[PDB]
Amino acid sequence: MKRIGVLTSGGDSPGMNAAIRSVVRKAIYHGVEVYGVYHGYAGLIAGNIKKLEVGDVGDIIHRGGTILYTARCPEFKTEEGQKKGIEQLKKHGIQGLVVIGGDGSYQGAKKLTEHGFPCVGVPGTIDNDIPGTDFTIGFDTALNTVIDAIDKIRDTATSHERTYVIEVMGRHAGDIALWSGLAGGAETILIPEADYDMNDVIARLKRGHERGKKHSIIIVAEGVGSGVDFGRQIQEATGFETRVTVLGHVQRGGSPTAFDRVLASRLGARAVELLLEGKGGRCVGIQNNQLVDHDIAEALANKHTIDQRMYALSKELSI
Amino acid sequence: MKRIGVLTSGGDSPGMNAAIRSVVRKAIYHGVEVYGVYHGYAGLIAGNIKKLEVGDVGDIIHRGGTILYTARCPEFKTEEGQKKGIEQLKKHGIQGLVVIGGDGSYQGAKKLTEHGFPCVGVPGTIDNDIPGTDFTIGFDTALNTVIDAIDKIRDTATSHERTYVIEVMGRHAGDIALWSGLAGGAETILIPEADYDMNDVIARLKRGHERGKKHSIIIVAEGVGSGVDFGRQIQEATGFETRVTVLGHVQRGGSPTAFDRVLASRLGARAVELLLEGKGGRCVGIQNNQLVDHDIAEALANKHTIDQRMYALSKELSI
Amino acid sequence: MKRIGVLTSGGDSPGMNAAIRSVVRKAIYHGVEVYGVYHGYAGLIAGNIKKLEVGDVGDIIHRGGTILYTARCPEFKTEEGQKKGIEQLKKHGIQGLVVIGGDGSYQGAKKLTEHGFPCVGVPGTIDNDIPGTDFTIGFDTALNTVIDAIDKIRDTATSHERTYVIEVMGRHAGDIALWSGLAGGAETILIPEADYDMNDVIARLKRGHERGKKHSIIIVAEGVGSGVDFGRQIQEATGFETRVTVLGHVQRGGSPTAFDRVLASRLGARAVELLLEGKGGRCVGIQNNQLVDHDIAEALANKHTIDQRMYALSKELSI
Amino acid sequence: MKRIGVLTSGGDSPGMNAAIRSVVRKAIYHGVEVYGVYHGYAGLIAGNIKKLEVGDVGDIIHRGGTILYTARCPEFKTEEGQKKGIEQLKKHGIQGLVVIGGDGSYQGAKKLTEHGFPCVGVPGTIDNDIPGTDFTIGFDTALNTVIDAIDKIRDTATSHERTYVIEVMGRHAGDIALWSGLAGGAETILIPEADYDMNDVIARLKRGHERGKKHSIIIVAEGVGSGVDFGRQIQEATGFETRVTVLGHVQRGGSPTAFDRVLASRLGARAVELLLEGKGGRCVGIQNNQLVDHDIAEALANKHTIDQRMYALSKELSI
Ligand SMILES: Nc1ncnc2c1ncn2[C@@H]1O[C@H](COP(=O)(O)OP(=O)(O)O)[C@@H](O)[C@H]1O
Ligand SMILES: Nc1ncnc2c1ncn2[C@@H]1O[C@H](COP(=O)(O)OP(=O)(O)O)[C@@H](O)[C@H]1O
Ligand SMILES: Nc1ncnc2c1ncn2[C@@H]1O[C@H](COP(=O)(O)OP(=O)(O)O)[C@@H](O)[C@H]1O
Ligand SMILES: Nc1ncnc2c1ncn2[C@@H]1O[C@H](COP(=O)(O)OP(=O)(O)O)[C@@H](O)[C@H]1O
Ligand SMILES: Nc1ncnc2c1ncn2[C@@H]1O[C@H](COP(=O)(O)OP(=O)(O)O)[C@@H](O)[C@H]1O
Ligand SMILES: Nc1ncnc2c1ncn2[C@@H]1O[C@H](COP(=O)(O)OP(=O)(O)O)[C@@H](O)[C@H]1O
Ligand SMILES: Nc1ncnc2c1ncn2[C@@H]1O[C@H](COP(=O)(O)OP(=O)(O)O)[C@@H](O)[C@H]1O
Ligand SMILES: Nc1ncnc2c1ncn2[C@@H]1O[C@H](COP(=O)(O)OP(=O)(O)O)[C@@H](O)[C@H]1O
Ligand SMILES: O=P(O)(O)OC[C@H]1O[C@](O)(CO)[C@@H](O)[C@@H]1O
Ligand SMILES: O=P(O)(O)OC[C@H]1O[C@](O)(CO)[C@@H](O)[C@@H]1O
Ligand SMILES: O=P(O)(O)OC[C@H]1O[C@](O)(CO)[C@@H](O)[C@@H]1O
Ligand SMILES: O=P(O)(O)OC[C@H]1O[C@](O)(CO)[C@@H](O)[C@@H]1O
Ligand SMILES: [Mg+2]
Ligand SMILES: [Mg+2]
Ligand SMILES: [Mg+2]
């Protein structure tokens, strides 16, 4: 092909720009021209497309968010929608599409190949809940953002000998909470994928307190419930002075981490290598520390799980 | 004197340890011995006092929180309380007291001099709401913590073209929100000390949006009300996709900033110079960029204000 | 006036962009139009001038360096040079000039007023060696960059029980080294403005070692000499395993600190208030915690000094 | 077994403490008791051994360096040395040994099993040059330290349109330089494991300059030669204003990254699981994203390589 497109959809993640940057550079090295779609699917339909030159991606490697923006397009679910967007691609002479984003987003990449547009999905979410990849672009970054918070909370919490319930993102996945909790020396990690017993959780807290622990840190994936309900519950049952912190969206921004920058680079490139080689309908990732690619349709069938053994470890080191 | 005490009271702040460290080193340089009171006023009464050696304060300069801990002692308000604590000092042969903390805390330093115990207050709060000082120990740190958050929020907010209401600490003071808002390129700063008109606030937001601004950042000092109420209000009136972030206690911890480290050092030292020179009942600070000291009783009479001109500036650069 | 110019000269500093941003916003609020000079004096002559619109300064507040670039123009020392540049201003209809930069730079602002061009200097250097100001834009940032280094060096140095000689910037001023050394718990601070005796320096190191200190940290302002010579000297005399680190230019970049962001904002604004009020030939600053302005010619006469008492403190807390 | 030892040898790395912490907690969970050896091999001989209690490892997770210290013991190469140390273990009733460190260090773990002391090596180096593992504890941290530097250098370098030669650690491995260079948008990466042609390197720089690039960033692994020689060489051949930065030991310290914290946790635990299960003479690691363990003797036979394809990528995205 001679012309490809690139867009960002779903929630933004740190590292989207390094991704955009490798697609752009990878394609040009190869003499292919790159077009940017602004506002994701929404601007695909609206024809918000501009050519990206070698230098338009200069000085974005270290930046958070996405320079192409992102938007929610519920009109792309529609036949008409996929038609209108498909028209826009042709009007511009764009033959392939690199889509960096979530699972919601991969679904649209799929619908596009089915109508003849070769697309490759690049996993961009802070959640790490994308099949076909061990790691998603932006997860490392979010992790470091969270332990940055925990580190701070531990200082205040030691000072006043208090218990903190910290609510982290990851709507349906416990990755953030699990790796965070571990890296942060947390005393409890409540994730979606594991059963917890509130009485055992309490027993364990009490026992650590008695054994002379100054603070207590509890990580709750938003996926489980609210930081406020667990705070309430725990304070009632232990009589310990409790506080709740909802990190929120700070999790979503920042200058991506080295890993995130390398990961995004490598995957965004790889995505281009596939469009050129005529592959299409695939999604890229990293598995067992190697670059892999799947069929979107089949990677989507698959389910997201965590290392249950890591969760155990959590429980053993928290003594 | 030959023996002094040092304690931390009120909410902990980044830089308390560098403070503790200068009191300890300053006193020993001078051949005076230093005693630590653990758990603030509460442990004063309980006699939780240990001698601090030159090296006990080694490797704390860069740390957040307070190695002496802090506690709320509502029994120190009481005559008996001040008696019991006064007894504990004598039992240990402690003649002077450096108290690092809030205004609540300065009140107790006052009650102590009145019963004959020379005390000097060291302003330790992230709030910056202590009379006699331009700057309180830990404020610089909190500031940097907050703009760290704003920086991140701006990335996500630009990405999705959204409006963010960010709630910062400072119970009755607008310092955090004001300096933050300014350093952060915020579009609105709602502080306690200034009147705001919600209709004007709205008008100004709308006008920036129209003039092509991608995101919108609103800083609300907890002192004004809730980030959630302003979010609600603003979304209703503009129809802009809004999100709210409550930074909370991350504001309170972390490795203190260079300024905070210098400030704490200089003030903690100065406090010792006063106890030795027999001054007592005073509080230290920095005014017009010089070390000053006041009478606690008179500095407390005084009121905390902000630079209203800085607030204006806020409004002019936000166009 | 209706049209002003703005430029950055000398070595770049973190906070130049927040400066540029307040000049730009301050001027427009006032209905004045702002022109940017690229490449400092050099591009003034070459006529590298572009109009700056309200949004061209959007999203630069948190960034390091200067979006207008900077260059060394030894042709501006020349009559012809100042003529050619003066011509360029007129050709564009620019009546005033905000110059953000060093002392070298202030000299040119001076030469410009003398030929009739109202100019105001904004102190932008990481060195803090500019008369008329307590603090220069970028100094807070450099400070935090350095203690960030020290913090790291302390970890490795404790680990292996070693002595580190750390060379910091500040060509003729000891500010960086002094505040750094203090905030960093350094054992020695060699600055230009103070006499040191290498034998005493040695004695003091030895004595701390014996008293059980694991590491040893020595800060040397480049202004004094080389980190390598002091390393050599010290190792020879103590037999302690020594290492040298030259921080270099990392000191010069980064996302400016809250203070730096506020300071730059306030000063860049103030500079505009002066051009409008017809003042000219002045330089802005912060003194005794208040915005002040001087005559460039007289502020330049003045000399840069440090708080000698802060240096003493250094020596007392280092026991 | 009922009693194990743990020590840190070689150059310290961020994450050693999280390692120490999992060995300590993992062993106690299991009812085994843990002994700490201070000063690595050197203190093994000298009998510098103290029992580690559950709480002695509290509040070290987020810290750099090693709380057990490290030292170079050239007397441990010696039969006598291994005898004396072996004696010390027995004198204390220590049956197993977890050794966290470099390859030099793994060699001693080997010599110890051969004389009957079960030992497991934990890869702790910032270099990433340890066989049996994809990743070594502390590498992620060093990486982030370096791109932190690059980010800063890019600001100053863009400002003045200059070329920077940045020298990074990794004595014989190009990992730091390679991942750094990539994550940092570097224009050249000179590593040991790849051939470079200085004329091509020059050609490529010139070509980027002409194509309008403001700065230029060159990463040189110390393993290749000196930042100063490449600076010299490059400046001579391009006439571009060049600067050199030697990051040095800042690479070695800091609060470990989330990955480093998880990695160290998981590996330090695993090491204990092996001593209990009677395995011995093994080394742990992570391969293809899974915990693996090897025979020290055989993992040492193996050689350290990099992803040559990642190096290519480097070259393609740098256009
Ligand atoms: N064509 C161009 N016009 C203006 N600036 C450019 C151009 N190409 C590159 N730059 C800038 O030069 C610097 C180095 O460029 P480049 O190597 O391509 O960027 P990066 O390392 O971010 O990919 C960056 O600030 C970049 O944005
Ligand atoms: N079945 C679908 N067909 C086409 N596009 C879809 C489909 N599902 C989602 N998308 C597209 O992807 C955009 C991003 O999807 P969304 O679910 O909101 O992302 P996320 O799951 O990451 O939140 C959608 O709004 C829409 O345009
Ligand atoms: N008496 C001591 N025993 C153990 N460690 C000590 C002792 N004195 C100092 N240290 C350690 O040596 C290092 C340097 O000491 P010092 O200069 O006094 O600390 P700081 O710079 O934090 O004030 C730090 O890790 C400190 O904690
Ligand atoms: N009037 C008082 N007399 C004695 N001690 C007091 C008085 N007011 C406050 N304090 C002491 O200082 C502690 C810290 O006071 P507090 O108000 O809670 O701090 P803050 O105002 O910073 O929250 C109190 O709990 C108490 O022991
Ligand atoms: N006219 C414009 N065109 C494009 N982007 C703009 C424009 N004006 C503002 N923006 C962007 O909108 C966001 C908020 O704008 P603004 O408040 O003016 O910036 P800042 O807070 O940095 O001064 C930033 O990303 C800014 O760069
Ligand atoms: N006497 C002078 N007359 C005019 N311009 C001058 C004079 N001295 C310096 N400058 C201008 O300012 C630029 C910045 O000066 P320079 O000394 O290099 O900055 P710094 O002192 O901060 O390094 C100079 O190269 C030159 O154009
Ligand atoms: N026995 C103890 N004595 C004193 N402080 C302790 C003790 N046990 C734990 N702590 C402190 O309590 C806090 C929480 O403890 P812990 O969960 O064991 O630490 P971490 O999360 O670092 O492993 C930390 O500051 C820790 O150092
Ligand atoms: N052949 C060996 N036998 C025993 N111990 C050894 C051997 N080689 C190295 N060591 C031990 O490990 C310590 C750490 O080794 P060293 O090579 O200096 O670490 P690194 O290679 O990581 O620098 C040595 O000083 C020594 O006690
Ligand atoms: O950004 P929104 O629409 O508020 O949604 C928040 C969600 O986005 C994420 O931050 C990123 O996918 C999730 O963890 C979180 O539940
Ligand atoms: O720490 P607590 O008891 O929750 O109180 C929170 C208060 O403490 C501070 O963080 C520090 O004084 C205030 O800004 C805030 O209102
Ligand atoms: O940037 P150059 O030309 O190498 O000069 C380095 C000088 O610039 C500064 O970093 C900033 O003025 C000084 O501390 C240092 O001596
Ligand atoms: O710490 P030393 O003895 O100066 O040795 C420096 C070496 O240690 C490391 O920093 C860590 O192994 C290497 O990259 C570097 O060559
Ligand atoms: Mg969705
Ligand atoms: Mg814990
Ligand atoms: Mg109170």
Ligand SMILES: [Mg+2]
């Ligand atoms: Mg703004």
Ligand SMILES: [Mg+2]
């Ligand atoms: Mg000069």
Ligand SMILES: [Mg+2]
């Ligand atoms: Mg020290």
Ligand SMILES: [Mg+2]
């Ligand atoms: Mg060796």
Ligand SMILES: [Mg+2]
């Ligand atoms: Mg580049």
